[PDB]
Design a protein around this nucleic acid. Sequence first.
RNA 1: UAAGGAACUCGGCAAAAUGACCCCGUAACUUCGGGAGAAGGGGUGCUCUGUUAGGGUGCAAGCCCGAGAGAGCCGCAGUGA
RNA 2: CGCAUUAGCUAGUUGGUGAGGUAACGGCUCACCAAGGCGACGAUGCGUAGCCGACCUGAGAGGGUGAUCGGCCACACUGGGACUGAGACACGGCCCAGACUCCUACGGGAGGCAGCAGUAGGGAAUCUUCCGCAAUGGACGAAAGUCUGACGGAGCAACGCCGCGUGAGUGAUGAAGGUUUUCGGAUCGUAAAGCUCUGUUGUUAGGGAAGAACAAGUGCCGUUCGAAUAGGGCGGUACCUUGACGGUACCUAACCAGAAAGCCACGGCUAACUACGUGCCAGCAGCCGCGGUAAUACGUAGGUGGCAAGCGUUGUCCGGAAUUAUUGGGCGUAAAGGGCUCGCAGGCGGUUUCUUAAGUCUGAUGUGAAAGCCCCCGGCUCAACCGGGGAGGGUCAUUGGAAACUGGGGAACUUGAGUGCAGAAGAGGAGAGUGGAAUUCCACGUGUAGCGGUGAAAUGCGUAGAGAUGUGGAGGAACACCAGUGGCGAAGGCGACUCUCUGGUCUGUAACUGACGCUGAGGAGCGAAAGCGUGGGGAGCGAACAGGAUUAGAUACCCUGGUAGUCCACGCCGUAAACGAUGAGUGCUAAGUGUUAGGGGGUUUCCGCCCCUUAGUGCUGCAGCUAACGCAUUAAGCACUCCGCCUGGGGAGU
RNA 3: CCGAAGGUGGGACAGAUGAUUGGGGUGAAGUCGUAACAAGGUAGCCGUAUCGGAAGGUGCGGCUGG
RNA 4: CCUCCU
Lengths: 122, 135
Amino acid sequence: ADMLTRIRNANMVRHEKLEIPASKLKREIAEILKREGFIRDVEFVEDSKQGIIRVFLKYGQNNERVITGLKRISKPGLRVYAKSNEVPRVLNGLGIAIISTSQGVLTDKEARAKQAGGEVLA
Amino acid sequence: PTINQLIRKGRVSKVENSKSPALNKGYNSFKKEHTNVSSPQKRGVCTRVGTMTPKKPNSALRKYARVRLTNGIEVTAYIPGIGHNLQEHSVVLIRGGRVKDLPGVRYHIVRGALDTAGVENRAQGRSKYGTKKPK
RNA sequence: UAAGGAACUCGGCAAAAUGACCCCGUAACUUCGGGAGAAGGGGUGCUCUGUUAGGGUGCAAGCCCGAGAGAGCCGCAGUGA
RNA sequence: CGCAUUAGCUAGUUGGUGAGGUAACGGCUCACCAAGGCGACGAUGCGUAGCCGACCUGAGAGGGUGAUCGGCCACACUGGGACUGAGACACGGCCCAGACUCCUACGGGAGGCAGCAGUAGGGAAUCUUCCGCAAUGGACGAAAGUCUGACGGAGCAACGCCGCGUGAGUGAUGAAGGUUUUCGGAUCGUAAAGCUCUGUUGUUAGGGAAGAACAAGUGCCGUUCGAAUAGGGCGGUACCUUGACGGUACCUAACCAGAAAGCCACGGCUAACUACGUGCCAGCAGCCGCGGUAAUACGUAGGUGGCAAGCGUUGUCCGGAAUUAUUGGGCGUAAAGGGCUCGCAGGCGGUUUCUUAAGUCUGAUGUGAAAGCCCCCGGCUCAACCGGGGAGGGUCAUUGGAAACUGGGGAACUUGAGUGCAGAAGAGGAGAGUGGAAUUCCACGUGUAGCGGUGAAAUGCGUAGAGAUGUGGAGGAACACCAGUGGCGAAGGCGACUCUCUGGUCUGUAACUGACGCUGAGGAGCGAAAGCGUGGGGAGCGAACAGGAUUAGAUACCCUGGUAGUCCACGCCGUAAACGAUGAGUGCUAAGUGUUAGGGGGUUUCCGCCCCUUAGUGCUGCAGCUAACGCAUUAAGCACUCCGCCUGGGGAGU
RNA sequence: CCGAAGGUGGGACAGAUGAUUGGGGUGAAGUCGUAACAAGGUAGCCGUAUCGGAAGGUGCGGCUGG
RNA sequence: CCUCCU
Ligand SMILES: [Mg+2]
Ligand SMILES: [Mg+2]
Ligand SMILES: [Mg+2]
Ligand SMILES: [Mg+2]
Ligand SMILES: [Mg+2]
Ligand SMILES: [Mg+2]
Ligand SMILES: [Mg+2]
Ligand SMILES: [Mg+2]
Ligand SMILES: [Mg+2]
Ligand SMILES: [Mg+2]
Ligand SMILES: [Mg+2]
Ligand SMILES: [Mg+2]
Ligand SMILES: [Mg+2]
Ligand SMILES: [Mg+2]
Ligand SMILES: [Mg+2]
Ligand SMILES: [Mg+2]
Ligand SMILES: [Mg+2]
Ligand SMILES: [Mg+2]
Ligand SMILES: [Mg+2]
Ligand SMILES: [Mg+2]
Ligand SMILES: [Mg+2]
């Protein structure tokens, strides 16, 4: 359940789109990523598997991406739980961390406000 | 190593060894035990005075003492200084420096614990050879 | 048989010592069986509690076997030879 | 805290019931019952250690230390016990025992410097047998006061840290004076030469501290008690009194900047050179390295940047050292993938939904002394220093939320993983039997002088007829051709044929199951060759061994022989460059081309061609990776899980 | 009754020391050969066995890091 | 076959 490597690998070879097995949180990550401007639309099909639809992330609609050099790292099975106070910022801004909360995500202000740091990405 | 592996078996630091082990052991007459005490010098008695050839690429007759310390450990130690400071079987104080040439000589005899000379009329820092400054 | 205790003698030869039962405990070494009763220690009579607990025999009465305890008693010494 | 090269420990042990004891709960003690308790989350044992505030270091994570100063603990010559009490099971008590000191006219007594000083001894090394309770704090007492080596002071010691200095300032002979020499010099050097201005301090005499609050003694007044005006005490209120340091700090004022500069370093790291004397000597050295007759690193002699009465040397700790790597490293060839499986524990685990709320997050409240370091930081002239308000401080309570994620329960799902069904290939394994070729030996026929061997020879075998040739017999071992970066197997491995028994893999189909999965320390198993045990077998080959050569020698290579062994059964051993020098699983990330076993689909009657596709097996090559070589969908790429392993070379796989 | 010290006993563990002995390290110019590095003059190396003054040799199997 | 030390 690592979309990040799927993205990195396709992003490296400047692929137009990629089909990632869908899960609720992998759906909710792709939309966080889409907040910038990736994904145009997907095709929900008759469900046989729970993810056959995939995420269909299409960050390279044109020849070259305006949003290129996508990079992620902080995804270990050893759980890394952030304090609302001590949520990090990727590159001191210019990068986001998908901090899984009971009710919120994203910036440093969206930590002391929202609360549960939980997961931490880059 | 995996995190699980690091938990199961931690990291292990390198054991650093002292360059002067003989000055690290004290002694007790009563218990007849070495004690762990960080000494800067040790008094001893010279069991043998002579000369030894250095290793390549050097040649010399390097004057030294086999010395028996207060802690009961027998060391070899270099008699430093130009001119005959070699001395004979007698009490002496020792120091912690190796003679790179002489293999086994890990200690210097301190000049000034008794009758000494070393290098007389030293240019600067006139305190390394027991050179009493004349007036 | 005083004191001593192998000084005896080729040589502890001879003698002395040890010795039963129950209990504790037991090394090197080993062919893993042993070594082993290793070694070294402790208990041991009699009386009462008491025809004790318990067991054998028997319908019972009774007869027989019988720990382990507790409390005593006596002697220099209780597997008192 | 360390050690598994410490794995079992415990028997009042674990719980019960009762009794007793204790300030007190309690195997705390005992009686009587059971059979527990502890331990791979490390029991038990051994080693080491007082713990903490802090301290040193570091960007921090961390690491080290726990002298001085504050708190908790423990101990008081060694060991045992109680007494007295609110309280020791006693630091200058006792009782008893022990080893030491003292006294004893010998019967018996006395004491414990880990209190201050001091001594001896040990050691590299650590003070005065000092003065005073004036101050602060004790104990006692109503108070005066006494006692106080607590404490305040002073002595000693450059052992630290630091003072504010040891002046400021005017002034170019660049004199004097130095060691060099291209016989000339040049820099110190406005600093001094000649001064001429101020007193941080002190060179000698006069003033003189603060520290002292007082406690009381006394005199008075409101309050509460008071038979009461007694007579005291307690709130405001007078008056009174005392200093070890010490005639010491500090001031004035002369003699007057006089008394107050130092040590170390100068290849490079790191800003800083020449004579002479040595001649691998003498000596030097943190590292690299200097010296053998022209030494910018040695002996001497003259010459210069830091910090400032010291700085050199040795010792210890942290840093540098992303050099044990959590932050923050590795394992194809540098050190490093376990020889390979099966797997217990453990670690890790697809998607949806519901519920839970241990983890996770979050609000609020309590503490985390004082000192120290630090945020604002103030005061004492700033300081080498003292006060307040904060902050940090917790994997910490308690409680109320949130619920995505991790975990738990319930319900689903089919993509993982299995099952069923239908095909496929295979030297996968075990057992029994069987075949042909060749070698060897034996017998026999024919035949006759060599054969064999080498670089060249010789030993061998041959006229007791070898070698060659023909025929037959005996026996053992290995399987030409097929045969191929072909196949199968977890690895080691597996190659004649046949049968018997038996394991796995691949493809297709999705009927069924519905995370049933991955990895896997220890454990168990398998594991080339050699080796070992017992019993067989023994053709060929062939360690050893012998002989012949070769050679200086030849315990080798070459030749001729030849034992174990190689083979079989059973058992053991457990290792190999057991290699892809590349752990397993999963996903993802250009192409091109062979080949092995399948599948589907083209027009076609097939064959055949072409397209697609699964799983192997090769080659080339993108991106990316790499110290480079190279790797590259069979990754050494990009990721996640789990295991194994590495930490300079030797010593030593000892 | 409990009970310190003491006594006796057999074990456990740790250090020191010991005739002698074993390899190891180190040491300007010792002796013997020449094993390795080139096809190192018999490719080398790994495991194992055996033999030999010594490096080493030889067998069997393995590897290419020939 | 070997080729002293710095
Ligand atoms: Mg007699
Ligand atoms: Mg007698
Ligand atoms: Mg006799
Ligand atoms: Mg006699
Ligand atoms: Mg007899
Ligand atoms: Mg201690
Ligand atoms: Mg470090
Ligand atoms: Mg190598
Ligand atoms: Mg290697
Ligand atoms: Mg392997
Ligand atoms: Mg292991
Ligand atoms: Mg074999
Ligand atoms: Mg055999
Ligand atoms: Mg041969
Ligand atoms: Mg191995
Ligand atoms: Mg192999
Ligand atoms: Mg290996
Ligand atoms: Mg496995
Ligand atoms: Mg050679
Ligand atoms: Mg060779
Ligand atoms: Mg041989």
